[PDB]
């Protein structure tokens, strides 16, 4: 199997089995540890941000990929944002500070 860009989940935006065009490979904790052991930060970021959970990051990437520009303009993965909302749904106030 293999995938470039495919359908995404509704609740949290993530690659998903799509009509049998197959969902993306799961990148697990031990794999994250492997990326951490190596000094490669960006590969890990793009791994768990742009290539997966970033709703803007994905498209804003793809456009650059086809534009011949290899970069990334990351953001907050939809996961952690959903978690911010879920936590803030209680009497718990969690906010981002400074500049």
């Amino acid at each position: 199997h293999a995938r470039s860009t495919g359908s995404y989940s509704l609740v949290t935006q993530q690659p998903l089995g799509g009509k049998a065009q197959f969902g993306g490979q799961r990148f697990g904790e031990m794999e994250v540890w492997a990326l951490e052991a190596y000094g490669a930060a960006y590969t890990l970021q793009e791994m768990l941000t742009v290539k997966s959970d970033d709703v803007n990051g994905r498209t804003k990437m793809y456009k650059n990929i086809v534009d011949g520009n290899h970069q990334m303009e990351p953001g907050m993965p939809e996961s952690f944002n959903v978690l911010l909302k879920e936590i803030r749904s209680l009497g718990i106030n969690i906010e981002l500070e400074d500049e």
């Binding site: 490979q25 031990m30 290899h70 009497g91 969690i94």
Partner: protein, 1345 residues
């Protein structure tokens, strides 16, 4: 310049309690109705859980009613139904709220482990719940009256108290009461009173439990929170898109349980609001309030009250707490993994035509993968009109797009990964090579790193999109960039199976063959001789070779000579580059030497030559292995001809012991052991028979009768070369296989006689079955265990990363060879190499510095230390590193996939945990010197006897063998009462007798000489009369103080040494006399009046392992039967024993206050009852507690205990792990320290060594002259050490989510990130490696102007 308002890239985070107004801030509207959609034309019902007015439009840039449908209309709110026209994405954003009728307790803060409301109010939980449920009234601000404040009342009591005082007294009940309690509370005044109270009563418990609470209180004050907010007024509602109503095929819908819960809460709240306006009786409204509390609680966290069930479904509905926690143990979003685009996977295979930097990538796969790159690259050159056209082109698979794909594939690396990732090598970058097929082709030399077989394992591919990811993959994760194991410097690219058999069959030699004795001008005509079928591969031949050496400074020196070698080796020499001496390939080249070849090649020439060398080696290996025609037949396994006899004799042996059991000559339990011993002894005979009949068995001839050499037998070549198979395995094919054991665990006394080559009857197989089953189960379990250990290890280390460069400390540890048992279970050059010196070491002749100060010790340096006889080198370690919150490079070391010193920003903790966890799947009476050297006695007090011998009077005594070179070879421990035929500085030979003693006897000897007196020994009381019936020589046996009579139990029996005059001979050089008391069950030697001398015994007294062992070690678990140590240095004493136990009174020669402890007497003692023992001495034997080591010995002692023990576990399994990683685990373990003195922080507070030291070192100057406080280092288990983290976001991962979030919330914790895990969760660059620069720069921009 104006600071900021809108959204830039944010720093850190803050978590705290939310005000009702703060809640209403997020809310864009109130949800006043339980309704969801319209039920016909499905649309959000206004003021419902789903609403366009409150939350957002159902369609992008379109009003709900449909008035303004144009993308032009944006900030306009529709007049019919107010809905701002904006993207529907805002339905994932906008919050809401609910105005509650009556106050409601937040279940998290009520039901938390400490119960935050409770300990804030100092009010018990039971009473609080009693109030909330309207079970009883609680007074609030009772003022001056008959009753106190927190005091609770009942119906009648409250009525009566009300009848007495209407005013100046106040009491309520329910949630409003707790709210009033919290609101009325004055933190300040309470603090003051607590401070006044803390200073009066002096008691441990009182002031401890007081200071803890006042700490918590002032923390809550500084937090910024307020008690009122613990009781919910407004209830926030989550965005609808996070609890979608979305439809499904067949018309059916699906929605989150949060809709059910929220709907219930809204319904009951509304009903309460109605009942209040209806003026319902109390019995009703109370019930409704309780129902509201229950509903809200069920919404926030379900399962803490009733476990409410969802509509039409038995299964309990999932609450918000369950939304945050998730499942599968402790995992929150990106830990447990996640789906990733630009990725794939497939079955894997061979392809040895590959080069170490490349891998076969299926055409279709590469197409679908780089598909977005192909799109742009097509219309970049102009081959496609637009993007759509490009899509159609690759969709039609037009012949051009292949050649267009070859462009994008060229320099763009891909990531290859396997399923059980352990060490960082589990993910390696290669260069894509287009391949026709659906299978992924992998380089053979990497198969060791991946631990991947060809039996249908699958691997996954990932595409490094961003430029930085490409360069990261190429300069870091690249295959050729890691040739070495992170665990140890040894090459991981070492040839595996077929290749080593090939090079083995090459460099092997045969006694007589074609071209024997002939001479050749060089390797060229050697290979030319072999390839022509003229000369045989293996034959003895002298050839002219030119070997080089780099021995000149930075320069290659050329030399040429005639070497005596074999044709095959000479052919192989065509490969080996430059400076390597011909002596490297001149051997048989097993799997070992073939690896050291690559190693040395890397430590001499460089990286590139090592890589190309490796590729060439693999190529020639497979080539000649193919040429070798090596096979395996049934006749290749040779069964010993003598085997059938060895059985018979053994089969006779048991029969002997079978008859003696019938005649009663031997007992059953003895018979079993005899039989099992002889049967097990037969196996060694058969096995070491077949080996001899295998290895040298080939008998050949050269111009004469017969000459024998190593066998060319195939299976043996495999076993010897290291290709596959081993002695234990070949043993099962030819000789008998083992002795099996029933599930009981006991071993059966009828071993399996037949082997695999022979047939196996029913029984034998059936018996082998249990072994098989338990084997599979065991391995399958040890996988999980290894995984868990790895997890705990990564958790305890993590954020530890190289930060500073050189901390510049002379501190470190003393590196010496392990010297275990007979000889050197691990050398010095290993534990030394790759580790920079702490201070300049000296030659035996001093004032000469070979290695200056701190310099990384590489191969040449260690070789120089090897020239000299030096047995010890002081080495800087991570545990001793002075750098706070990290490790300096000059401490850690070099070792890495590269030979150079460790880089700056590399995360060492992670690779440490990985290096320790990866191999962990493989885990489960007289001194005679083995070598020739000179005797050296270490730490011993002894005396010379009347027999001229030497008897040791010291319990702790060491015997080292120091040869003429000055190096320590043998090391042993010599018990008290041992007899030495030698002395310090003597001379011995191999096998020579040095020390002798008896295990069952603990002889009590005498240093001085004279007659033997008897004091405080009375028959029937202290002692007892017993005379031997076989001799008549007797002794009066000392009766133990447990079994003695009424008044004789109080006397301590002794043997006091007297001279001719009848005086007391004193202990030499002291005022203190010599009298040696005797313990219980201690039989004497000579009676009263009988004269003795030195060395004569006064009386002679009678007498887990594997992976979980490592687990126990790292967790610092106290053993079951710990060895007791002397807490204070001094002379030991036995007081009057009490209550089934025994007092032990230590007597300090130095100061004062003789310390006494309770030791159960049943435990066999060690320490001489009448002698002095230093602190840390063994009062009894057995396992030692790590805490005891840390406390009674010290940090350097305990770290050595850990490292040596765990290495004792791993090295026993044949596993190489550098001490470094374990040392970092240790560093993380002892990180915490508990303060003793004061003047800055609290008294008994456990606090970080880094924190404390960074404080006191700041207080040694300025401040007060020194007000700095003392502490004590504390040993924490890896899990307990992992429990401590500054970042609450990181803690919310592996710990319990609820508790962490709550405790962090009440405190107002500000998570500054700075750590790895927390930055991974929030999805930004890791504060290490590549990203380390970024986070450094920002860290500098922060806390500055």
């Amino acid at each position: 310049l104006k600071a900021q308002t809108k959204t830039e890239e944010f720093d850190a985070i803050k978590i705290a309690l939310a005000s009702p107004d703060m809640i209403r801030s997020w809310s864009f509207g109130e949800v006043k109705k339980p309704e969801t959609i319209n039920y016909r034309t499905f649309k959000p019902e206004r003021d419902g859980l789903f609403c366009a007015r409150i939350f957002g439009p159902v369609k992008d840039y379109e009003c709900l009613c449909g008035k303004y449908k144009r993308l032009k209309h944006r900030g306009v709110i529709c007049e019919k139904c107010g809905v701002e026209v904006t993207q529907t994405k805002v339905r994932r954003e906008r919050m809401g709220h609910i105005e509650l009728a009556s106050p409601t307790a937040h279940i998290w803060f009520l039901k938390s482990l400490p119960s935050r409301i409770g300990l804030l109010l100092d009010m018990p939980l039971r009473d609080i719940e009693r109030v909330l449920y309207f079970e009883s009234y609680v007074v609030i601000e009772g003022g001056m009256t008959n009753l106190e404040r927190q005091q609770i009342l009942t119906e009648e009591q409250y009525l009566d108290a009300l009848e007495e005082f209407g005013d100046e007294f106040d009491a309520k009940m329910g949630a409003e009461a707790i709210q009033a309690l919290l609101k009325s509370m004055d933190l300040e005044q309470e603090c003051e009173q607590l401070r006044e109270e803390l200073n009066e009563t002096n008691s441990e418990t009182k002031r401890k439990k007081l200071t803890k609470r006042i700490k918590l209180l002032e923390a809550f004050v500084q937090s910024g929170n307020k008690p009122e907010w613990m009781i919910l007024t407004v209830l926030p509602v989550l965005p609808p898109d996070l609890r979608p109503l979305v439809p499904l095929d067949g018309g059916r819908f699906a929605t989150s349980d949060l809709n059910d819960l929220y709907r219930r809460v809204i319904n009951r709240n509304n009903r309460l609001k109605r009942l209040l306006d209806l003026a319902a009786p109390d019995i009703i409204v109370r019930n409704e309030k309780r129902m509201l509390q229950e509903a809200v609680d069920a919404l926030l966290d379900n399962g803490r009250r009733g476990r409410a069930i969802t509509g039409s479904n038995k299964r309990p509905l999932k609450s918000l707490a369950d939304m945050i926690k998730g499942k599968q143990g402790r995992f929150r979003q990106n830990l447990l993994g996640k789906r990733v685009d630009y990725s794939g996977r497939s079955v894997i295979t061979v392809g040895p035509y590959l080069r170490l930097h490349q891998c076969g990538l299926p055409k279709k796969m590469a197409l679908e993968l780089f598909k977005p790159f192909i799109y742009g690259k097509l219309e970049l050159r102009g081959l496609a009109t637009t993007i759509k056209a490009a899509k159609k082109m690759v969709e039609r698979e037009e012949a051009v797009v292949w050649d267009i794909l070859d462009e994008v594939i060229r320099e763009h690396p891909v990531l290859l990964n396997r399923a059980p990732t352990l060490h960082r090598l589990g993910i390696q970058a290669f260069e894509p090579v287009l391949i026709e097929g659906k299978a992924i082709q992998l380089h053979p030399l990497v198969c060791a790193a991946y631990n991947a077989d060809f039996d249908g394992d699958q691997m996954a591919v990932h595409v490094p999109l961003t430029l930085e990811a490409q360069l990261e993959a190429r300069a870091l994760m690249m295959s050729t960039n890691n040739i070495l194991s992170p665990a140890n410097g040894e090459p991981i690219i070492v040839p595996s199976q077929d290749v080593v058999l090939g090079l083995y069959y090459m460099t092997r030699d045969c006694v007589n063959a074609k071209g024997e004795g002939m001479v050749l001008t060089g390797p060229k005509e050697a290979e030319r001789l072999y390839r022509s079928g003229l000369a045989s591969l293996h034959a003895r031949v002298k050839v002219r070779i030119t070997e080089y050496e780099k021995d000149a400074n930075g320069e290659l020196v050329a030399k040429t000579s005639l070497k005596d070698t074999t044709v095959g080796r000479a052919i192989l020499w065509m490969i080996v580059p430059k400076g390597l001496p011909y002596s490297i390939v001149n051997q048989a080249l097993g799997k070992k030497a073939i690896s050291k070849m690559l190693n040395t090649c890397y430590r001499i020439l460089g990286l590139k030559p090592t890589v190309i060398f490796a590729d060439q080696i693999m190529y020639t290996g497979f080539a000649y292995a193919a040429r070798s025609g090596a096979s395996v037949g049934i006749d290749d396994m040779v069964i010993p001809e003598k085997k059938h006899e060895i059985i018979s004799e053994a089969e006779a042996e048991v029969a002997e012991i079978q008859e003696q059991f019938q005649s009663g000559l031997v007992t059953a339990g003895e018979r079993y052991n005899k039989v099992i011993d002889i049967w097990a002894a037969a196996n060694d005979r058969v096995s070491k028979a077949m080996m001899d009949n295998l290895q040298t068995e080939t008998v050949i001839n050269r111009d004469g009768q017969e000459e024998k050499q190593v066998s060319f037998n195939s299976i043996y070549m495999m076993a010897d070369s290291g290709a596959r198979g081993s002695a234990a395995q070949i043993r099962q094919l030819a000789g008998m296989r083992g002795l099996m054991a029933k599930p009981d665990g006991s071993i059966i006394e009828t071993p399996i006689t037949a082997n695999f080559r022979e047939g196996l009857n029913v029984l034998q197989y059936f018996i082998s079955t249990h072994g098989a089953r338990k084997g599979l189960a065991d391995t399958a379990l040890k996988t999980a265990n290894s995984g868990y250990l790895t997890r705990r290890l990564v958790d305890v280390a993590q954020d530890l990363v190289v930060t500073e460069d050189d901390c510049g400390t002379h501190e470190g540890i003393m590196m010496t060879p392990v010297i275990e048992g007979g000889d050197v279970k691990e050398p010095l050059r290993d534990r030394v190499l790759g580790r920079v010196t702490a201070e300049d070491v000296l030659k035996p002749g001093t004032a000469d510095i070979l290695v200056p100060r701190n310099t990384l010790l590489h191969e040449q340096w260690c070789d120089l230390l090897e020239e000299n006889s030096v047995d010890a080198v002081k080495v800087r370690s991570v545990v001793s590193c002075d750098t706070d919150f990290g490790v300096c490079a000059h401490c850690y070391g070099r070792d890495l996939a590269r030979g150079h010193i460790i880089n700056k920003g590399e995360a060492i903790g992670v690779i440490a945990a990985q290096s320790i966890g990866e191999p962990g799947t493989q885990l489960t009476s007289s001194i005679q010197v083995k070598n020739k050297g000179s005797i050296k006695l270490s730490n011993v007090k002894s005396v010379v006897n009347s027999s001229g011998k030497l008897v040791i009077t010291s319990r702790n005594t060491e015997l080292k063998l120091i040869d003429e070179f000055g190096r320590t070879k043998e090391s042993y421990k010599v018990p008290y009462g041992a007899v030495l035929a030698k002395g310090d500085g003597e001379q011995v030979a191999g096998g020579e007798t040095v020390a002798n003693w008896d295990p069952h006897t603990m002889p009590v000897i005498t240093e001085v000489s004279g007659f033997v007196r008897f004091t405080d020994m009375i028959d029937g009381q202290t002692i007892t009369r017993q005379t031997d019936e076989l001799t008549g020589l007797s002794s009066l046996v000392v009766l133990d103080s447990a079994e003695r009579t009424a008044g004789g139990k109080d006397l301590r029996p002794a043997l006091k040494i007297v001279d001719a005059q009848g005086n007391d001979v004193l202990i030499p050089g002291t005022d203190m006399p010599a009298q040696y008391f005797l313990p219980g069950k201690a039989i004497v030697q000579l009676e009263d009046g009988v004269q003795i001398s030195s060395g004569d015994t006064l009386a002679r007294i009678p007498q887990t392992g594997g992976l979980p062992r490592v687990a126990d070690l790292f967790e610092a678990r106290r053993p079951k039967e710990p060895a007791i140590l002397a807490e204070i240095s001094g002379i030991v004493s036995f007081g009057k024993e009490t209550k089934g136990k025994r007092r032990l009174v230590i007597t300090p020669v130095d100061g004062s206050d003789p310390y006494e402890e309770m030791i159960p007497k049943w435990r066999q003692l060690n320490v001489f009852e009448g002698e002095r023992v230093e602190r840390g001495d063994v009062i009894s034997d057995g396992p030692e507690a790590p805490h005891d080591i840390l406390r009674l010995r010290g940090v350097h002692a305990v770290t050595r205990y850990i490292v040596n023990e765990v290495q004792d576990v791993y090295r026993l399994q044949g596993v190489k792990i550098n001490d470094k990683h374990i040392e970092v685990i240790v560093r993380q373990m002892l990180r915490k320290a508990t303060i003793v003195n004061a003047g800055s922080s609290d008294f008994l507070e456990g606090e970080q060594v880094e924190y404390s030291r960074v404080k006191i070192a700041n207080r040694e100057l300025e401040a007060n002259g020194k007000v700095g406080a003392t502490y004590s280092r504390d040993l924490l288990g890896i899990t307990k050490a992992s429990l401590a983290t500054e970042s609450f976001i990181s803690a919310a991962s592996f710990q319990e989510t609820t508790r962490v979030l709550t405790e962090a919330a009440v405190a107002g914790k500000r998570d500054e990130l700075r750590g790895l895990k927390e930055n991974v969760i929030v999805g930004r660059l890791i504060p290490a490696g590549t990203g380390y620069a970024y986070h450094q720069d920002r860290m500098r921009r922060r806390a500055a102007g």
